[PDB]
Amino acid sequence: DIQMTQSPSSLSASVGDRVTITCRASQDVNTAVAWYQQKPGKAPKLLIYSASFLYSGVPSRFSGSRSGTDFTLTISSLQPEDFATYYCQQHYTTPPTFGQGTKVEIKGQPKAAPSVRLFPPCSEELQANKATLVCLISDFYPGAVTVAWKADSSPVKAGVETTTPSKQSNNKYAASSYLSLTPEQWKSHRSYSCQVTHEGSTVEKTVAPT
Amino acid sequence: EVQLVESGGGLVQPGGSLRLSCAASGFNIKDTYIHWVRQAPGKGLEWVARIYPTNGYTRYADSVKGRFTISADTSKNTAYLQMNSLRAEDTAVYYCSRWGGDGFYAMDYWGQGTLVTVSSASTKGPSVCPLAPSTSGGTAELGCLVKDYFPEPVTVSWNSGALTSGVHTFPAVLQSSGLYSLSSVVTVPSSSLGTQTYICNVNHKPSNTKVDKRVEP
């Protein structure tokens, strides 16, 4: 197949920025390239076809260009409705292939830090010889977070399952992380910690077999 | 104007079969090529198949050849995707789209998409575990763990829906096992612990499961 290599995979932008998104085809595809916009829960929408032609009704702040195998989409002055995911596609051959997408996202002017709530295992699980720590994370923007688990001070590799953040109704994010333990492990340590990193800042919660 | 409406998505098990429909209005599918394109959860776009309804000619991606059949009925202005021998990896939102027409090989109109989930997991009700908590004269967090269920969704209420302030039910994790877990938390007055009754009501209709757990501190 022809590969379409898109970059960057995401970028955060202010209203009024000039944004350029790049896409390299693994081989010549002439000018047979289209750009699509997609928003959450909706279908793709065509913006640009044949590398540089604006589809009907698309605002002229959008432009496309080609240099050899390098395709570019430019938004001259980013407007609120432009925050979305963008995809390139080659339609030069069959199968047509798509880039992997670029997410253009609202920069959090005041960023919103997460609340973190951590619970130890329940008795009912312990009696069935099971254990789950529950780390619940809410009210954060932007919607990206990393979770690290500690046993005492040691990083815990195994048994971690973490959701992708999901948009709350207030347009901030929520996420959960679950650490599965044996009762043995839970009781063999003084503490387990859930450390949430958002925008470089860490919020840590600890619980103990107490 | 131009519209493409799809139907037929669902939950199915590997080896199973499903049929999607794509009904066109505001143009004639004879004038153009109709395509199916899919998007796996959290992923990009993958072309699946294409048909020229004027002559029946078809093309497929290799990942679906011998499994999926694209067809059209011009008298119904409708295209179809017959999906047999389904695999977990086919799990996606399936869109139909059209080419503009003539040389116009961009996809200018897309349907709204239809979800297809392929999983070998079978229905299982959740087990429900109370999560027990303290800042004196402040607030505490309690909750319920709703573990190992399939499929979505579950509903959670507290005190049969009387208790609303401070409630936060979180979206589920899909585990590597193929099962879901979620949690619901309430922030309550510390002064209320040991005295106020707090009950989470968990409802999983596919398993006909209704569980109430009292949360004690």
- The span from the CA of B128 to the CA of A81, in Å, is 42
Say whether the peptide bond before residue A121 is cis (omega within 30 degrees of 0).
no
Task: Write out A66-111 in H/E/C secondary structure.
Answer: EECCEEEEEECCCCHHHCEEEEEEECCCCCCEECCCEEEEECCCCC
Q: What tokens were used for B136? A: 């004196």
User: Long-range CB contacts (< 8 A, 24+ apart) of A162-166?
Assistant: A162/B173, A163/B170, A163/B171, A163/B172, A163/B173, A164/B42, A165/A140, A166/B171
**Residues B112, A42: C-beta atoms closer than 8 Å:** yes
Query: Which residues 74-133 of A are in CB contact (within 8 Å) with B?
Result: 87, 89, 91, 94-101, 117, 119, 122, 124-125, 132
- A43 touches B: beta carbon within 8 Å: yes
State which of A61, A86, A106 marks the end of a domain: A106
- B127 touches A: beta carbon within 8 Å: yes
SS3 A185: helix
Residue A50's domain comprises: 4-106
* Identical fold, B3-118 and B127-214: yes
Q: What tokens were used for B93? A: 């939102």
- The amino acid present at B1, given as its one-letter code, is E
Q: What tokens were used for B12? A: 């199915």
Q: What tokens were used for B110? A: 């897309």
- The amino acid present at A166, given as its one-letter code, is S
**Residues A95, B183: C-beta atoms closer than 8 Å:** no
- The span from the CA of B123 to the CA of B150, in Å, is 5
**Residues B45, A178: C-beta atoms closer than 8 Å:** no
Q: How many domains does chain A have?
A: 2
CA distances from A88 to A101, B66, B75 (A): 7, 28, 34
- B176 touches A: beta carbon within 8 Å: yes
| CA contacts within 13 A on the Cβ side of A123 | 8
State which of A106, A125, A146 marks the end of a domain: A106
- The amino acid present at B209, given as its one-letter code, is T
Same domain, A120 and A76: no
The CATH code of the domain that includes A135 is 2.60.40.10
Scanning every residue of chain A, which has its alpha carbon at the shortest distance from the alpha carbon of B130?
A122
Resolution for this experimental structure (Å): 2.1
Same domain, A42 and A78: yes
CB within 8 A of A138, min separation 6: which ones? A114, A115, A117, A168, A172, A173, A174, B168, B170
Closest CA to B145 of B153, B156, B137: B156
End-to-end CA distance of chain A: 58
Same domain, A102 and A121: no
Same domain, A99 and A119: no
CB within 8 A of A148, min separation 6: which ones? A155, A194, A195, A197
Beta bridge partners of A197: A146, A202
Which among B97, B107, B173 has CB closest to A163?
A: B173
Same domain, A72 and A146: no
Per CATH, the architecture of B127-214 is what?
Sandwich (2.60)
Q: What tokens were used for B14? A: 């590997």
Q: What tokens were used for B80? A: 């179809």
Which chain A residues are within 8 Å of B45, Cβ to Cβ? 36, 44, 87, 89, 98
- The amino acid present at A178, given as its one-letter code, is Y
Same domain, A97 and A8: yes
- Concatenated DSSP letters of chain B: --EEEEE--EEE-TT--EEEEEEEESS-GGGS-EEEEEE-TTS-EEEEEEEETTTTEEEE-GGGTTTEEEEEEGGGTEEEEEE-S--GGG-EEEEEEEEEETTEEEEEEE---EEEEE-----BPPEEEEE----TTSEEEEEEEEEEEBSS--EEEEGGGT--TTEEEPPPEEPTTS-EEEEEEEEEEGGGTTTS--EEEEEEGGGTEEEEEE---
Same domain, A138 and A99: no
Read off the DSSP letter of residue A44.
-
Same domain, A90 and A120: no
- A165 touches B: beta carbon within 8 Å: no
- The amino acid present at A152, given as its one-letter code, is D
Same domain, A91 and A182: no
- The span from the CA of B16 to the CA of B87, in Å, is 8
Handedness of CA B87, B90, B96, B100 (dihedral sign): negative
State which of A106, A128, A160 marks the end of a domain: A106
* Boundaries of every domain in chain B: 3-118, 127-214
- Concatenated DSSP letters of A139-178: EEBSS--EEEEEETTEE--SSEEEPPPEE-TTS-EEEEEE
By CB atoms closer than 10 A (0-12, 13-18, 19+), residue B121 is middle
Same domain, A182 and A99: no
SS3 A124: helix
Q: What tokens were used for B172? A: 């589920």
Longest pairwise C-alpha distance within chain B: 77
Same domain, A161 and A102: no
SS3 A23: strand
Integer-rounded Cα Rg, in Å, for chain A is 23
Which chain A residues are within 8 Å of B95, Cβ to Cβ? 43-44
Topology, domain B3-118: Immunoglobulin-like (2.60.40)
